[PDB]
Scaffold this active site. Sequence first.
Site: not given
Ligand SMILES: O=C(N[C@@H]1CO[C@H](CO)C1)[C@H](OCc1ccccc1)[C@H](O)[C@@H](O)[C@@H](OCc1ccccc1)C(=O)N[C@H]1c2ccccc2C[C@H]1O
Lengths: 99, 99
Positions: B25-27
């Site tokens: 996860d690059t995010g």
């Molecule tokens: O939560 C995230 N990052 C934070 C920063 O560091 C913490 C980990 O050390 C997590 C990511 O979201 C972007 C972000 C960046 C900076 C601040 C706040 C938020 C993380 O990659 C999530 O995007 C990802 O987290 C991994 C994940 C994957 C699958 C299920 C749950 C969680 C997620 O929430 N995915 C869901 C998503 C997002 C947008 C549109 C549709 C969907 C369906 C799912 O894929």
Amino acid sequence: PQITLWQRPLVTIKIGGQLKEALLDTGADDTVLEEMSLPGRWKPKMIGGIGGFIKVRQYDQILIEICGHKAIGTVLVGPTPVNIIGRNLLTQIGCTLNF
Amino acid sequence: PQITLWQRPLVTIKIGGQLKEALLDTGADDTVLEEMSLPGRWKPKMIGGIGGFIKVRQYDQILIEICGHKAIGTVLVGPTPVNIIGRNLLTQIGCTLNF
Ligand SMILES: O=C(N[C@@H]1CO[C@H](CO)C1)[C@H](OCc1ccccc1)[C@H](O)[C@@H](O)[C@@H](OCc1ccccc1)C(=O)N[C@H]1c2ccccc2C[C@H]1O
């Protein structure tokens, strides 16, 4: 281009004639942008992240330019902490993970 | 290897002698895994993503093997819906985004 991950993979995107910063997120299935105005009708959708679920507005066939690469797909709008470019659009620009 | 994003980028990891499935996860700034036991002392921390914040336990200097590549770094443990390999460890295996 080749993007390292020592810092957040933030790039500039163009949508609705406006420049915004967004994160290239392989962990996101869809693309979600902070509250803004887009054309057309929207459909309801719930997406779940690490802290739970949020309701977003789904817009289809939206034109968006990512680092010069033009893409046209689904964009979700809602209370997201940052603008996120998910797999649905990353695949359109031919983005891959390498190591 | 080169990983396409048509599907979620899931890989097998080895930690604490256990094999688990995790998302590249690059995010994600840091790595976060669902509840499990790890050696050493930990520190409480709050991390926020889509949906809000969750409380996790922070462990440092943890060894993890990702696709055969050894990497050392901080690992957070908590009520995450899926195991996530974040940037702090992706950099160690030389993972980059390309398009
Ligand atoms: O939560 C995230 N990052 C934070 C920063 O560091 C913490 C980990 O050390 C997590 C990511 O979201 C972007 C972000 C960046 C900076 C601040 C706040 C938020 C993380 O990659 C999530 O995007 C990802 O987290 C991994 C994940 C994957 C699958 C299920 C749950 C969680 C997620 O929430 N995915 C869901 C998503 C997002 C947008 C549109 C549709 C969907 C369906 C799912 O894929």
